[PDB]
Design a protein that fits this description.
- It is a single chain.
- Helices cover 12% and strands 34% of the residues.
- It has 128 residues and is mostly beta strands.
- The chain has one domain: Roll (Chitinase A, domain 3).
- Strand 1 and strand 2 form a beta hairpin.
- The protein is globular, with a radius of gyration of 14 Å.
- Bound molecules: the ligand COc1ccc(CC[C@@H](OC(=O)[C@@H]2CCCCN2C(=O)[C@H](c2cc(OC)c(OC)c(OC)c2)[C@@H]2C=CCCC2)c2cccc(OCCN3CCOCC3)c2)cc1OC.
- The ligand COc1ccc(CC[C@@H](OC(=O)[C@@H]2CCCCN2C(=O)[C@H](c2cc(OC)c(OC)c(OC)c2)[C@@H]2C=CCCC2)c2cccc(OCCN3CCOCC3)c2)cc1OC binds next to strand 3 and strand 4.
- This is Peptidyl-prolyl cis-trans isomerase FKBP5.
- It is found in: Cytoplasm; Nucleus.
- The PDB classes it as isomerase.
Length: 128
């Protein structure tokens, strides 16, 4: 399914090229710009563990999800992945634990050593 497709087809967007964050573009965005470090970004997303059954979405909570890019407000895979996206783009991201919650985990939602899968839609981004 979508996570295996990312394994097979995803672009490795890590600096180290360790296949820790793999991306597939599912919808091409608009324009040319991608967000800068410190930009306020606006997204919709859905996420899940690759193993077991825990699913999370911005769509429930009744609004875009906002954060400052590249400042450690979200897991490393997001800082890396969202920085690659154009406005309007949708991607799928497969995130190995080294770019997520690592050996520690974050319970109840996240076990130790968890690979995560996300669908992210970049709605907008603005310099702080
Ligand atoms: C620097 O490293 C970290 C930084 C931040 C965190 C916290 C978890 C982070 O969530 C995430 O980073 C990812 C990506 C963004 C969407 C949510 N994310 C998740 O993993 C989800 C998530 C949602 C959660 O709530 C909706 C979580 O509870 C806080 C949560 O806790 C671990 C994890 C999980 C993904 C798959 C299925 C289960 C849930 C998150 C969740 C909810 C809101 C967040 O930021 C809100 C905006 N902040 C608010 C504070 O001021 C700065 C801006 C960030 C852990 C960090 O490592 C310990």
């Amino acid at each position: 399914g979508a996570p295996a497709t990312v394994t097979e087809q995803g672009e490795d967007i890590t600096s180290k090229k360790d296949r820790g964050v793999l991306k597939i573009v599912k919808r091409v965005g608009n324009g040319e710009e991608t967000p800068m470090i410190g930009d306020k970004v606006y997204v919709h997303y859905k996420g899940k563990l690759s193993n077991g059954k825990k699913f999370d979405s911005s769509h429930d909570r009744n609004e875009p999800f906002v954060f400052s890019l590249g400042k450690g407000q979200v897991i490393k895979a997001w800082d890396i992945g969202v920085a690659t996206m154009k406005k309007g783009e949708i991607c799928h991201l497969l995130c190995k634990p080294e770019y997520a919650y690592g050996s520690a985990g974050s319970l109840p939602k996240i076990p130790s050593n968890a690979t995560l899968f996300f669908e992210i839609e970049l709605l907008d981004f603005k310099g702080e």
